[PDB]
Design a protein around this ligand. Structure first.
Ligand SMILES: NC(=O)c1ccc[n+]([C@@H]2O[C@H](COP(=O)([O-])OP(=O)(O)OC[C@H]3O[C@@H](n4cnc5c(N)ncnc54)[C@H](O)[C@@H]3O)[C@@H](O)[C@H]2O)c1
Ligand SMILES: Cc1cc2nc3c(=O)[nH]c(=O)nc-3n(C[C@H](O)[C@H](O)[C@H](O)COP(=O)(O)O)c2cc1C
Ligand code: SF4
Ligand code: SF4
Ligand code: SF4
Ligand code: SF4
Ligand code: SF4
Ligand code: SF4
Ligand code: SF4
Ligand code: FES
Ligand code: FES
Ligand SMILES: [Zn+2]
Lengths: 150, 118, 584, 117, 118
């Protein structure tokens, strides 16, 4: 664990009231998730009532408590993509990759997550992979794309 | 001063400013259901069982979170409040696992408390 | 020569950086002095990535451009002066027909100015309203001009500003706060991200103006962290405004000081509501509190606070500059201003549309959107997202306003257009919208905690084929009670999709329940498959594309579908060229 | 008319009214009631002595009806309101009757104290 | 009565605290326990975890209650309206009964808190 370089984050954000969310976002940007040791380190040296830290980290719709792969898949699950049939794309992803949403692949290369909306609703369905968006998508297209990446 | 007086459920009562309607009704023997109310801490508004109808308000108000004023008319046993409380209790009973009374007592025809004297 | 590229978030969903760096390489090799400017989307997110070319006083747009297409553009048109007529869809003499009916007010800088440069905003009549309000008008004059302008509130709500905005100004306290609720938790509605990435200087000017008017010196932006490009552009604009004495202390010599801070939210849909957002800003769990007390009497840390959308703060300076008397002519009587919508779904010309109110929905769907994608039959339009309602095929004549949309059971909300044709199951759409509110409820009050899950269980049981008699009655009984008793605004307008699709599409619920079949035939387990023996001749195209082999038959003879083995995936009819696969 | 030959409100509610209309000689017959009304401080208007005829009260009813009452609620809650409206068709309204009716209909929570003697 | 087609959360809880028993199956999520432990006691040994149906009240970092900052005061027990929080048995075998109550004062501290012995 990289706690030595986690020390500057709460060494700089200290003294700001209501700074639990910012500390948690920086910790997740560093580690890719929120390990229990990092939460314990945040609870120490900044008090902030450890139970409240855990409740904040759990709520907030987005904070990963588990490690992720090198390429993070974010499937746009908005209204426009669901109208055009993103369920079939999700089924194709689950069939080809053998994983369920919220989990990680065995080789640690792909991680499936469902987001509310990516916002590029004109090119529905959309899939985000490490900030690269693929729009106007079909299951054959996503299978070819994931084969080309891997 | 001037004797702050409210009118709840048909009766006229003399109360003190700063108190909630829940406390004021309970001081005069009027029962309003509540689950999430403690008079020594702040209001929460989770259960919603303390809803009453107050004249001048379009929607039901939570008597655990509204302080008494002068000359306000309150009803606690209307159709709307009873419907809301029954729906809330049905939703709560939709999630509860437990034995209120043991099997031995419920099998007795006279419902003697077998667990108690055993 | 001027080249504009609408490279933004939707551009990343297209060629995006490819056309930009290819054009940069081409101009680097040629060595010409041509100004390449990254802009935001015009609003036509289809046909992206948009490229605008300036020849003299003429502007051409012939986009859908890749790296090879950009190279051909540079070789043929940028140097040779020859347009490619096979890609031309908009010229100066022939502009976009879609923008012909659009009174562009909120997007008057999108696709025109450089968002990362304050100079382009200043050259496009920007920040002049700021100087006018600072030097020539009093804050009371600002409030009265807003009042004659007819502004009451944007982003749902509806209560008038003068009872909340002027009330926030009149609120006692040495410290007042301004919050711009720049989180757009609505799926499919992306007006705030588009404004932030296309013209953040207008929003910064607007927030400065309302801060000057209400007497607040410090303000916050509640912006989600999945909005980086927007955060980077906003911080660049903030740095530029600090550098050019447009922000900070003593702007244009005037005594009023205004400083900016950017707060990145964690991204929860319930973290709006003006009481959960306060708790999020306060560093706690976003859970709605009890109203009353209102944030006008106790908001940020117990201090009075004014919270408004980006739309309101954008509209305020543009009212300030010209005058609210001009905007009283546009639209209906009861509500004034302009509306910003995002058209999506089974539509042809989808994307962001700027409109006035009073304009009929059939105009928006057909005349502006080009009709229905694949020329299908229009069925319904959804307004407000998961918290909104549905409008059927019989009410396209309803004008867009607060009162008319409130009449038909829907909610304005963020103002999102979803177009659904006859191939969308309505019960599945209600189930989807209710699943979104189930996944985004804070679970404090018991109605939104339990009842909205009970309705979801009913809907998922209907959309499988295990529904019973009376499920409509249980749905109505749950919906009215959840709407009445929920503490937060999320659970109050939670059953609006079910309540609007149960009175406008009640005949399909019975079809899913009694007949156990799906009228739209897009509702998986409620189907059956048959082969027409007359209109198909044994090419085995469907049986080859069913990798379980539940369809048996010889060559040049009609096949037989085994019902006990096929799982009704839907690929038995997607490839049949003779269309003899009947679905019942 | 109402079902019970009794007053519909208590004396304890005299302090929260914003208008008290006195009919009869309450001061001379029940003077402690006048003590309470005076100490409460609410606005009290006595029925004029020059209106000792029931036709003046009918003019009062007509002036109240012309001030915009809800006809549908009183139609569904009463019997014989249509004939009451018909019998007040050609009733003229005077100035003092109009002033009294305006005072009564303007106030949110009025009481009428009638001396039975 | 319960319908089998709806789901109630069943727990396999293992919290062998010597004094405080917590049953999430009987919780109505009124939040009185966390509010008292935060605002009154100040230990903040318990808190909310999750959203919606998945909201559950549990100690810090899902640790046992004996591994956290608990005082074992029992105020969470005293404010609970249901059987989700109960205190442990002082007698040889405790039972549900209507106990007789006598008012006395505590015999340990000079603060002299008033008690009801049941
Ligand atoms: N983007 C959007 O606009 C959007 C998104 C989702 C939901 N909604 C809508 O939000 C609405 C609910 O709004 P809400 O949850 O903020 O509560 P609300 O509508 O009851 O409150 C309306 C506004 O009036 C203010 N107000 C009321 N009385 C006041 C007083 N005496 N003094 C000062 N201010 C006062 C409130 O603070 C609030 O700003 C719903 O109609 C829902 O559809 C809107
Ligand atoms: C679930 C939910 C989400 C909301 N999201 C927003 C939002 O994103 N932006 C916004 O301005 N208001 C939002 N609101 C409504 C706010 O309460 C409202 O903006 C605020 O009370 C005052 O808005 P006004 O400036 O139009 O009066 C939301 C309300 C709810 C219940
Ligand atoms: S099982 Fe126990 S906690 Fe639940 S209702 Fe019955 S007595 Fe109360
Ligand atoms: S209505 Fe839903 S989101 Fe709002 S406070 Fe209640 S449970 Fe939370
Ligand atoms: S429907 Fe498909 S599988 Fe059946 S006979 Fe025709 S081509 Fe062959
Ligand atoms: S229903 Fe789909 S998966 Fe099943 S046999 Fe037919 S084509 Fe294959
Ligand atoms: S006090 Fe009891 S019922 Fe209330 S939330 Fe805590 S454990 Fe649940
Ligand atoms: S016993 Fe006291 S300190 Fe321990 S959890 Fe309960 S209230 Fe908190
Ligand atoms: S008197 Fe002392 S030991 Fe007894 S309950 Fe009070 S504080 Fe605790
Ligand atoms: S609806 Fe899919 S990206 Fe926005
Ligand atoms: S007692 Fe629970 S809402 Fe008031
Ligand atoms: Zn269906």
């Amino acid at each position: 664990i990289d706690l030595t370089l986690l020390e500057p984050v709460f060494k700089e954000y200290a003294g700001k009231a209501g700074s639990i969310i910012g500390i948690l976002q920086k910790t997740q940007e560093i580690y890719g998730y929120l390990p229990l040791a990092a939460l314990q380190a945040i609870a120490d040296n900044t008090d902030n009532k450890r139970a409240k830290i855990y409740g904040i980290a759990t709520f907030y719709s987005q904070f990963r408590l588990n490690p992720v792969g090198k390429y993070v898949i974010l499937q746009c699950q908005g209204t426009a993509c669901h109208v055009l049939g993103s369920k079939a794309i999700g089924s194709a992803i689950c069939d080809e990759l053998g994983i369920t949403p919220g989990q990680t692949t065995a080789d640690g290369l792909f991680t499936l997550e469902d987001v509310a909306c990516l916002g590029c609703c004109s090119l529905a369905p959309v899939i985000m992979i490490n900030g690269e968006a693929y729009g106007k998508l079909t299951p054959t297209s996503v299978r070819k794309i994931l084969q080309d990446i891997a | 001063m001037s004797k702050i007086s409210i009118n709840i459920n048909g009766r006229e009562l003399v109360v003190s400013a700063g108190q909630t309607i829940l406390q004021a009704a309970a001081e005069h023997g009027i029962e309003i259901p509540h689950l999430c109310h403690d008079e020594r801490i702040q209001p929460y508004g989770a259960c919603g069982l303390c809803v009453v109808e107050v004249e001048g308000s379009p929607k039901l108000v939570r008597s655990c979170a509204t302080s008494v004023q002068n000359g306000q008319v309150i009803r606690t046993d209307t159709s709307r409040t009873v419907v809301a409380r029954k729906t809330a209790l049905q939703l709560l009973a939709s999630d509860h696992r437990g034995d209120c009374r043991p099997p031995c007592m419920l099998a007795c025809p006279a419902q003697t408390d077998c667990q108690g004297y055993v | 020569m001027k080249v504009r590229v609408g490279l933004g978030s939707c551009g990343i969903a297209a060629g995006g950086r490819k056309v930009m760096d290819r054009l940069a390489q081409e101009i680097k090799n040629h060595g010409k002095e041509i100004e390449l400017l990254p802009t935001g989307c015009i609003g036509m997110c289809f046909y992206e990535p948009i490229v605008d070319v300036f020849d003299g006083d003429k502007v051409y747009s012939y986009a859908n451009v890749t790296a090879d297409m950009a190279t051909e553009i540079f070789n043929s048109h940028i140097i040779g002066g020859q347009p490619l007529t096979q890609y031309i869809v908009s010229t100066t003499e022939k502009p976009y027909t879609i923008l012909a009916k659009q009174v562009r007010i909120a997007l008057r800088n999108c696709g025109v100015i450089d968002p990362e440069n304050v100079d382009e905003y200043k050259a496009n009549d920007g920040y002049k309203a700021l100087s006018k309000a600072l030097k020539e008008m009093t804050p009371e004059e600002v409030i009265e001009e807003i009042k004659v302008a007819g502004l009451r509130g944007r982003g749902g709500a509806g209560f008038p500003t003068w009872f909340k905005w002027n009330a926030a100004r009149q609120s006692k306290g040495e410290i007042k706060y301004v919050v711009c609720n720049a989180d757009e938790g609505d799926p499919g509605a992306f007006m705030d991200r588009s404004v932030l990435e296309g013209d953040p200087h207008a929003l910064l000017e607007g927030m400065a103006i309302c801060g000057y008017a209400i007497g607040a010196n410090e303000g916050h932006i509640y912006c989600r962290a999945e909005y980086p490009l927007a955060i980077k552009r906003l911080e660049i604009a903030i740095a530029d405004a600090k550098q050019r004495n447009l922000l900070g202390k003593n702007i244009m010599g005037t005594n009023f000081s205004f400083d900016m801070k950017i707060k990145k939210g964690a991204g929860a849909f319930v973290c709006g509501e003006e009481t959960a957002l306060i708790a999020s800003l306060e560093g706690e769990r976003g859970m709605p509190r009890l109203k009353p007390p209102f944030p006008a009497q106790s908001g940020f840390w117990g201090k009075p606070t004014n919270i408004n959308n980006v739309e309101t703060f954008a509209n305020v300076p543009w009212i300030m500059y010209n005058g609210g008397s001009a905007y009283a002519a546009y639209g209906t009587e009861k509500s004034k201003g302009t509306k910003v919508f995002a058209l999506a779904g089974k539509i042809k010309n989808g994307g962001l549309v700027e409109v006035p109110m009073g304009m009929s929905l059939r105009e928006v769907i057909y005349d502006i959107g080009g009709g229905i994608l694949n020329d299908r039959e229009f069925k319904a339009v959804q307004m407000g997202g998961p918290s909104g309602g549905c409008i059927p095929k019989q009410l396209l004549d309803t004008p867009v306003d607060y009162d008319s949309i409130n009449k038909t059971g829907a909610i304005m909300g963020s103002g999102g257009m979803i177009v659904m044709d006859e191939t969308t199951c309505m019960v599945d759409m209600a189930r989807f919208f209710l699943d979104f509110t189930v996944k985004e409820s804070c679970g404090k009050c018991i109605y939104c905690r339990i009842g909205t899950k009970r309705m979801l269980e009913i809907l998922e049981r209907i959309t499988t084929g295990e529904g019973r008699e009376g499920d409509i009655e249980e749905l109505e009984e749950l919906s009215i009670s959840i709407k009445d008793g929920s503490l937060c605004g999320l659970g109050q307008t939670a059953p609006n999709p079910v309540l609007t699709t149960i009175r406008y599409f009640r005949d399909e619920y019975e079809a899913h329940i009694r007949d156990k079949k799906c009228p739209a035939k897009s509702c998986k387990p409620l189907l059956t498959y048959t082969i027409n023996q007359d209109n198909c001749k044994g090419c085995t195209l469907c049986a080859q594309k069913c990798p379980v082999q539940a369809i048996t038959g010889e060559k040049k003879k009609p096949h037989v579908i085994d019902q006990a083995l096929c799982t009704k995936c839907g690929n038995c009819a997607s490839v049949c060229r003779l269309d003899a696969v009947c679905i019942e | 008319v109402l079902g019970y030959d009794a007053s519909t409100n208590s004396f304890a509610e005299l302090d929260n009214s914003d208008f008290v209309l006195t009919l009869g000689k309450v001061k001379e017959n029940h003077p402690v009631l006048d003590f309470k009304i005076r100490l409460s401080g609410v606005c009290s208007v006595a029925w004029p002595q020059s209106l000792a005829n029931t036709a003046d009260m009918k003019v009062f009813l007509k002036a109240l009806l012309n001030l915009g009452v809800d006809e549908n609620k009183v139609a569904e809650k009463t019997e014989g309101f249509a004939e009451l409206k018909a019998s007040l068709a050609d009733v003229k309204v005077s100035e003092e009757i109009q002033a009294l009716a305006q005072k009564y209909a303007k106030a949110a929570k009025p009481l009428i104290v009638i001396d039975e003697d | 009565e319960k319908d089998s087609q709806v789901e109630c959360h069943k727990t396999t809880e293992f919290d062998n605290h010597p004094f405080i028993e917590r049953n999430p199956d009987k919780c109505v999520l009124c939040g009185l326990c966390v509010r008292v432990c935060d605002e009154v006691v100040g230990a903040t040994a318990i808190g909310l975890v999750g959203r919606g149906f998945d909201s559950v009240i549990m100690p810090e970092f899902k640790l046992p209650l004996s591994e956290t900052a608990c005082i074992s005061c029992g105020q969470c027990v005293d404010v609970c309206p249901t059987g989700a929080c109960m205190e442990k048995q002082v007698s040889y075998k405790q039972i549900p009964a209507n106990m007789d109550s006598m008012a006395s004062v505590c015999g340990y501290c000079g603060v002299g808190c008033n008690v009801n012995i049941e």
